[PDB]
């Protein structure tokens, strides 16, 4: 029923509100591959990353109407829900520039 | 945004 | 036209053309200065096209087919080029935010081609 | 407006 | 690609 | 793979 629009190489951590400094996204270091979903059905999107190594899902996040996408640097894109703040940072300027275009992409179309 |  | 053709995005750029035979960037449609460039898709049969127009005049400054397979080059954050069988084009974009606007709605077509 |  |  |  979902239809990744793209697949992106990416270490994704969240920010520690407490700690200030980021954290590595499910508790583990290191890249995972994280794509965007499209549920066609419904015309929604969610971001959904596994790790590299293990296929832990590291991060299963909505994409809503009208997010502030930030991108920060040309490797490190971030944006936050009202609970979390979440960034990837990219294995390279080509995974980054796949990422950005497929989640502008999604903010278009919501 | 927290910077990185 | 506008019953085939979806604009996918608008953004600012100074359009020209390499001269190769000159070794230089031309304006694209003789004069130099900034245009609204989009890109359309004709959703019916999945293709698409760069169309820019200039913002004093409205002159039509490119139109040209997306092929399949293109190789988008992002030289630098505010200017893209690419090229055909005929012409290289390139994008002087007014801003950084006017070229990531264009560059994901190329990557984007570029993916569904 | 063009034709393509 | 040409420079710019 | 999780559901949403």
Same mark, same amino acid.
């Given at each position: 029923?979902?239809?990744? $629009? /793209?697949?992106?190489? %990416?270490?994704? +951590?969240?920010? &520690? &509100? =407490? ?5 590595? =996204?499910?508790?583990?270091? #290191? ?20 790790? $590299?190594? &293990? ?5 299963? /996040?909505? $994409?809503?109407? #009208?997010?502030?996408?930030? !991108? ?11 609970? !979390?703040?979440? #960034?990837?940072?990219? #294995?390279?300027?080509? &995974? =980054?520039?796949?990422?950005?275009? %497929?989640? +502008?992409? %999604?903010?278009?179309?919501? | 945004?927290?910077?990185?």
């Amino acid at each position: 029923s979902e239809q990744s $629009i /793209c697949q992106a190489r %990416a270490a994704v +951590m969240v920010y &520690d &509100d =407490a700690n200030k400094k980021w954290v590595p =996204a499910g508790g583990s270091t #290191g890249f995972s591959r994280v794509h965007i979903y499209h549920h066609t059905g419904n015309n929604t999107f969610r971001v959904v990353g596994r790790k $590299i190594q &293990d296929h832990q899902v590291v991060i299963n /996040c909505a $994409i809503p109407k #009208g997010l502030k996408y930030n !991108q920060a640097t040309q490797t490190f894109h971030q944006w936050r829900d009202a609970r !979390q703040v979440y #960034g990837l940072n990219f #294995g390279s300027k080509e &995974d =980054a520039n796949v990422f950005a275009s %497929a989640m +502008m992409h %999604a903010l278009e179309v919501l | 945004x927290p910077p990185x």
